[PDB]
Ligand binder design. Structure first.
Ligand SMILES: *Cc1cc2c(cc1C)nc1c(=O)[nH]c(=O)nc-1n2C[C@H](O)[C@H](O)[C@H](O)COP(=O)(O)OP(=O)(O)OC[C@H]1O[C@@H](n2cnc3c(N)ncnc32)[C@H](O)[C@@H]1O
Ligand SMILES: *Cc1cc2c(cc1C)nc1c(=O)[nH]c(=O)nc-1n2C[C@H](O)[C@H](O)[C@H](O)COP(=O)(O)OP(=O)(O)OC[C@H]1O[C@@H](n2cnc3c(N)ncnc32)[C@H](O)[C@@H]1O
Ligand SMILES: OC[C@H]1O[C@@H](O)[C@H](F)[C@@H](O)[C@@H]1O
Ligand SMILES: OC[C@H]1O[C@@H](O)[C@H](F)[C@@H](O)[C@@H]1O
Ligand SMILES: OC[C@H]1O[C@@H](O)[C@H](F)[C@@H](O)[C@@H]1O
Lengths: 567, 567, 104, 52
């Protein structure tokens, strides 16, 4: 028996733990995954010396822990088998495929991560705020009060994540890109560093934030926290929350211990579901909320009818570019260069502090030393130059988020290469659904998730195409596309920004929603949901900071309404 | 000051730790890599519930921690860049390529793993013994004595790794393949389970062994080992062992703390280098052994002239097959079938204990149950059936090792798919070298490894091609090739069975070697090397068990010649 | 729908087609060799602006077809090579080979 | 296919692609020698490789 139970140890679950453990509550947390980021439980897997020396290899870490949500039955013809080899006569259900899934109405790129710390063990750490246009209301009819509340919540969330906008300031590549783009837009658009949940440790090492940063996930009481009470139980599949008959309270959490194999129930005062946008919905439907099986509107569910509807996933367009000759030449614009590299007579000089220099001394010293010490290398950019991390944030006139950067997720020198990702907002629509099969089960014997999704016609589709054209226009100012990384739409859901599955609003019926602004499930005194599933709006920016802000507000309600047990 | 220092926390360094910590030595171990396998330090990363339910994803973990040893300068032509993008006029040194490396005399597949536990955090766990044809002598002029010593050491090594040959005995696929090959080669070749360092925990979970199995890597003293002394120090690059001017002793170990950046000098009575075949050799050359730089026979080294010569790497051929119709039908040969699947009166039955049955009762029960419970599925093989793990071990008449299995490293049902890997032996030749640049450095600022390797032209090459042919012949008995996994040689070194880089012999001169049969570096009182680099022969079987056997012997010597410090 | 936009290339003395004095082609004639780059100024600026124009214009009709994404084609695949024996009024002043009657 | 069938490349540079999965028994040169009708005069980076 606990004061609070939390399902999921990602960053949102850790937000609840951070708030509630600190406030004196007896907290248990369960995760279906296991501890696997070293001794700092739930930490970013990219924070090893080896990955930061070999960042090209981290893509495999990511790929290794993204398990696809819904894979349709495969209908590829292989007709070059030997005649002796067994072959079926039909495209039968095999290799994990979901026979409920229409392959043409899927989010084929959607995937989940079952490890302690969740997706925060691999994420890119971009943590922008949403502007009003993207942001759910927390106060109705008072924009100033709504702004105040959001500013306070985001500020706290930025603290928890260690968000900053300074960590890349001494990158020549970063500055080359930012300054060019700012020139070219002539005041029409603002460029800044991507706000990043991270702390630079040295010129070549960044400590990327994660769930661990928000809450260290060590059992308590401990030497550092002798009055706090926290237990983490990894490898525990949480299966059902038990409703009373009134549907006003949850009475227990049913769990499956994956190691021992045994099933147990856990009693708490407060139940918090932070299992991700897909898996929160799964656990709710497996507990009698919404509707199990293929949507049947002749028989609308009577508990939480908007659960699994109005789902939103962002369009994502991507390319890479190769830095223009003009830009590369500009790096050395202050230099006086004589002779031929590699010969006796060659020299590269600049005047320190000259007001007519385009660049500061630190830049020109780095460029001079590279050019003089590495005369075999034809570029002016130092080898260990940090990567670019640039954004122009969503605005009404360009309603997409942008990242102009190097993401982990070879003929051309990497110093020339810049990634472009533009993220569209998707209108919530009732027909876009995440539902669960009443007969097919997944690898943990839970109802199999199935999507029924298409990008809404109208504004969403128009904007997604305008967004593609915007990426093509803007990237051109920096360089031409890198062959093999040409402008493209990414597989639906590969972006992993799914929202709206258990969406927030003021009124269950009027706002077609599942939780109120305290993240409390309508009707239930002691059930709360956290995560991107809560977000009910069309948004283009990366959602986790916003989800964390909502979680902070939800914890405030819990602190106002439930008393910790005596220690 | 420690009694013993060990460089490297792989399964070999852990063999030394197990033995010497257990003998009461004050032991320090250093690894350049970090703790990242969960709370069991150095354990197998595949030992998670999620990976064993998604085995298809583990390949990405492997790829994520194999960092290529020597990458040649890239000469691919990219001539569809935009006219505005920067381009060099030459194929200059970029993206961490090694300009010393002839791309045509490389082991391009060779890679290293820098994590606590080394490569045993991702390995396949195949641990066969070598027969006399593949194995160095430990006793001269007495074959029965040599056999007896090898049997004693291998039996101990098998206990350390928890090697077994029974963990897959209840797999229908395994037995299907094993029995068919036994029948086809009646009286010509013998087949058995691959000996595997693994313990089965349930019908769907195997605890694969690793460094952590051999030694748990927990600092000591501790509650369970109150009288032992052991410290592990991750994220520490060991750079040099300091030789006296006599070249008779090592005086200290120089280390670089990668977190803090500082360097230190560590003293021990005994120094053990278990950094892998590549990095053992690197550390030694960086410490004045052998020769730094492109080899120069006009100036042979003074100290250990055989170091980095006579290197061996195995040829490896690969394909996959799709199980034959005849074999698939044979799985259900004892069943009586009535009706059509999906109909109310469909029936699959068998008679338990019937003399005419071709299979044991447990087999038929599994088949009947799958066919009745999954009438939509056209195959008789149960869904959770463990993979095949079959071998015919190396013999004079078929001088290659074989694995007929499923290794972690989509239209066709995976139940049909078998992997074939045949591994050739490579003659040691002085000309095949691993050397280290005197001007290029690697990501840790150590002399850049460079290979000069070709498969020797005579027996090695003849056998390699005969081995290919043997896989084509043998595989056809099970099924045709899987399109996209057709019979092929794998890139040189992808097999990661490199040997002979610091090779063992009785006589440094006569046997062209670096260590004696106690793995002690000739001339030096207190320096020992462990790993496959010690193996001086041509071998086709997987080397790690043999390396460990040699380490046990080395440890006996240390125990007999050095006194632990008083506790 | 296919989209092909074709840029103009400034004539520059340095961009050459020449013929080996030792290598021969399949008909035993001196082997052709190019020494070509797109000129760095107006030609290159226009080329990239042309790319951008195709992306902008094409979007009015539909999105790109996966596998035929916007790209520069290999140099010369267009087969619109010119100026190898070029016309002018004055052999010297106009750096040319034929007059306006195409007479050498 | 008719088009491709009658476009004969004008100048093909010397090929430097690394093929390191040949069988140990197959012949291999130790250099990227002039082969398969390539033009050793041609700088592969100052070509019109598409010309035919
Ligand atoms: C994968 C990815 C994600 C990502 C990113 C890049 C990649 C490659 N870049 C991001 C960025 O730059 N900015 C941003 O805002 N987001 C970015 N993301 C997404 C981000 O990682 C997620 O939005 C965030 O991690 C969501 O947090 P949340 O805490 O809500 O969920 P989670 O991380 O998925 O963790 C959920 C956990 O719950 C567990 N679980 C699941 N089901 C169960 C059940 N039934 N029982 C018990 N536990 C369960 C998981 O195992 C997991 O740990
Ligand atoms: C990658 C791989 C390995 C493998 C295999 C499958 C794959 C995909 N399957 C195998 C199998 O079935 N059977 C078998 O016998 N071998 C298998 N292997 C190879 C096997 O994993 C290795 O042979 C074995 O791990 C070697 O053990 P050893 O202990 O000698 O070496 P290591 O595991 O490489 O660990 C060495 C460590 O030392 C560190 N290091 C390196 N340099 C330094 C320096 N300078 N300073 C301090 N430490 C250093 C590493 O970081 C590492 O952990
Ligand atoms: O792969 C798509 C991802 O790419 C990164 O650039 C973003 F920061 C993420 O928010 C997103 O999940
Ligand atoms: O990928 C090559 C590897 O594959 C596995 O099947 C083996 F067991 C190994 O010994 C080897 O390292
Ligand atoms: O493939 C390039 C060619 O394509 C066609 O569309 C054009 F009409 C041509 O003038 C040109 O030679």
């Amino acid at each position: 028996k606990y004061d609070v139970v939390i399902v999921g140890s990602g960053p949102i679950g850790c937000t609840y733990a951070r708030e509630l453990v600190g406030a004196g509550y007896k907290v248990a947390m369960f995760d279906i995954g296991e501890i696997d980021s070293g001794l700092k439980i739930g930490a970013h897997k990219k924070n090893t010396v080896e990955y930061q020396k070999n960042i090209d290899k981290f893509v495999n870490v990511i790929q290794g822990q993204l398990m696809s949500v819904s894979v349709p039955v495969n209908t590829l013809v292989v007709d070059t088998l030997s005649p002796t080899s067994w072959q079926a006569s039909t495209f039968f259900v095999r290799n994990g495929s979901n026979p409920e899934q229409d392959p043409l109405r899927n989010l084929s790129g959607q995937a989940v991560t079952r490890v302690v710390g969740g997706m925060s063990t691999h994420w890119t750490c971009a943590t922008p705020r949403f502007d009003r246009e993207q942001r759910p209301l927390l106060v109705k009819d008072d924009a100033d009060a709504d702004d105040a509340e959001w500013d306070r919540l985001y500020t706290k969330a930025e603290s928890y994540f260690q968000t900053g906008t300074d960590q890349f300031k001494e990158s020549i590549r970063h500055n080359l890109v930012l300054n060019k783009l700012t020139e070219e837009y002539k005041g029409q658009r603002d460029f800044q560093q991507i706000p990043l949940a991270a702390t630079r440790r040295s010129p070549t090492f960044v400590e990327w934030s994660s769930a661990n940063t928000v809450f260290d996930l060590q059992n308590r009481p401990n030497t550092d926290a002798p009055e706090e009470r926290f237990n983490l139980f990894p490898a525990v599949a949480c299966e059902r929350v038990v409703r009373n008959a009134l549907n006003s309270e949850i009475e227990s959490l049913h769990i499956h211990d994956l190691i021992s194999g045994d099933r147990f129930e856990i009693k708490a005062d407060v139940y918090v579901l932070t299992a991700g946008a897909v898996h929160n919905t799964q656990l709710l439907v497996n507990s009698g909320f919404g509707q199990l099986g293929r949507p049947n509107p002749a028989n609308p569910p009577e508990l939480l009818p908007s659960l699994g509807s109005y789902i939103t996933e962002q369009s994502l367009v991507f390319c890479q570019t190769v830095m223009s000759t003009e830009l590369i030449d500009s790096v050395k614009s202050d230099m006086t260069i004589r002779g031929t590299p590699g010969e006796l007579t060659y020299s590269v000089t600049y005047t320190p502090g000259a007001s007519t220099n385009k660049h500061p001394d630190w830049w020109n010293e780095k460029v001079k030393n590279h050019m003089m010490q590495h005369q075999e290398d034809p570029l002016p950019i130092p080898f260990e130059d940090p990567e670019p991390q640039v954004t122009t944030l969503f605005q009404p006139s360009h309603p997409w988020h942008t990242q102009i950067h190097r993401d982990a997720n070879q003929s051309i020198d990497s110093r020339l290469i810049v990634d472009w990702r533009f993220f569209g907002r998707t209108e919530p629509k009732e027909e876009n659904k995440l539902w669960f099969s009443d007969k097919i089960t997944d690898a943990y014997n839970m109802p199999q998730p199935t999507f029924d999704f298409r990008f809404p016609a109208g504004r969403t589709s128009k904007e997604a195409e305008d967004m593609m054209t915007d990426m093509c226009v803007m990237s051109a100012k920096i360089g031409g596309f890198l062959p093999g990384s040409l402008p493209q739409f990414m597989e639906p859901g590969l972006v992993l920004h799914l929202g709206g599955t258990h969406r927030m609003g003021f009124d269950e019926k009027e706002d077609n929603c599942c939780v109120n602004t305290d993240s409390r499930v309508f009707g239930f005194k002691n059930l709360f949901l956290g995560g991107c599933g809560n977000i009910p709006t069309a948004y283009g920016a990366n959602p986790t900071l916003t989800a964390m802000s909502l979680a902070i507000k939800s914890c405030e309600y819990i602190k106002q309404n439930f008393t910790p047990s005596p220690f």
